[PDB]
Design a binder for this molecule. Structure first.
Ligand SMILES: O=[N+]([O-])c1cccc(/N=C2/N=CCC(c3cccc(Cn4cncn4)c3)=N2)c1
Length: 290
């Protein structure tokens, strides 16, 4: 595209590559995502340009030229995964963790009220600035194309944040999947280890089952009728969160437990999450950004 100077490759997506670039007119610097895109795709993506929220990475333009689609986004200078690697040694303080989870819930509360889900939340698509904001990136991209097993660079698309209804074959899942992803990310920022690092689908499910208990009709009506449910699934006993996310306080474990309910129908909504006591004292710290 003529209108942009690519200034650097910043990343590789499932769908495409990201370059930092400069609007050759506005001189705005933007993140330029390179993915005749089969055209529900176009309609459903061009739509996101009005799904605007402070904790949503602004989608400034879509440009469809030849067999290429560029998505043009406000540039944020880094992602949650690098910031969390940048704080292995100490971890993100708790007050910043809370503020991020709060901001992310606001993002989701908004998308979800407009019936839009992300479906692929993960630290790599949460972008942070130096003013203590965090935003969700890559919406409607999973609806508009479905998520593949490799990326365009043949890289493995991670299952670590994927809700159990999706892993169980559910075709028609809901805004709850994103709450499950955000729960996994919340536990990961507190402990500095991913919570469920599956390396395949059945490994992902079994790491889930090992921590939260193999699900049954007690905890999740309808689950034994799911498409990839098997009676032969080993029966693991649930485990106490106090062990899973120390040192989260009671209010944060209580909220985590609700974002991780097996039954998407019981899993706390974003709206409800925003009201939980864990946020009574939430403040917006400044990240240490390097
Ligand atoms: O993960 N990054 O490429 C990355 C690193 C550092 C800064 C970055 N800045 C932005 N700013 C706005 C949007 C944006 C972005 C947009 C869509 C998807 C993603 C996630 N992704 C990462 N690689 C491919 N996609 C990031 N990145 C991105």
């Amino acid at each position: 595209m003529e209108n942009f100077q690519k200034v650097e490759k910043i990343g590789e997506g499932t769908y495409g590559v990201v370059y930092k670039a400069r609007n050759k007119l506005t001189g705005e610097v933007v993140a330029l995502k390179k993915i005749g895109v089969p055209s529900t795709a176009i309609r459903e993506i061009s739509l996101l340009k009005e799904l605007n929220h402070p904790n949503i990475v602004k989608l400034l333009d879509v440009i469809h030229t030849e067999n290429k689609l560029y998505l043009v986004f406000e540039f944020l200078h880094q992602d949650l995964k690098k910031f969390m690697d940048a704080s292995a040694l100490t971890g993100i303080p708790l007050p910043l963790i809370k503020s991020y989870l709060f901001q992310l819930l606001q993002g989701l509360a908004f998308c979800h009220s407009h019936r839009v889900l992300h479906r692929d939340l993960k630290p790599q698509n949460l972008l942070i600035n130096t003013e203590g904001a965090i935003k969700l990136a890559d919406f409607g991209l999973a609806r508009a194309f479905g998520v593949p097993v490799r990326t365009y660079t043949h890289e493995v698309v991670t299952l670590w944040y994927r809700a159990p209804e999706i892993l169980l074959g559910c075709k028609y899942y809901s805004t709850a999947v994103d709450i499950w992803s955000l729960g996994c990310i919340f536990a990961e920022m507190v402990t500095r280890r991913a919570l469920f690092p599956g390396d395949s689908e059945i490994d992902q499910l079994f790491r889930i089952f090992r921590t939260l208990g193999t699900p049954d009709e007690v905890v999740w009506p309808g689950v034994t009728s799911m498409p990839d449910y098997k009676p032969s699934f080993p029966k693991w006993a649930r485990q106490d969160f106090s062990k899973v996310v120390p040192p989260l306080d009671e209010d944060g474990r209580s909220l985590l437990s609700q974002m991780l309910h097996y039954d998407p129908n019981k899993r706390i909504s974003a709206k409800a999450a925003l009201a939980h006591p864990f946020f009574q004292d939430v403040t917006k710290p400044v990240p240490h950004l390097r």
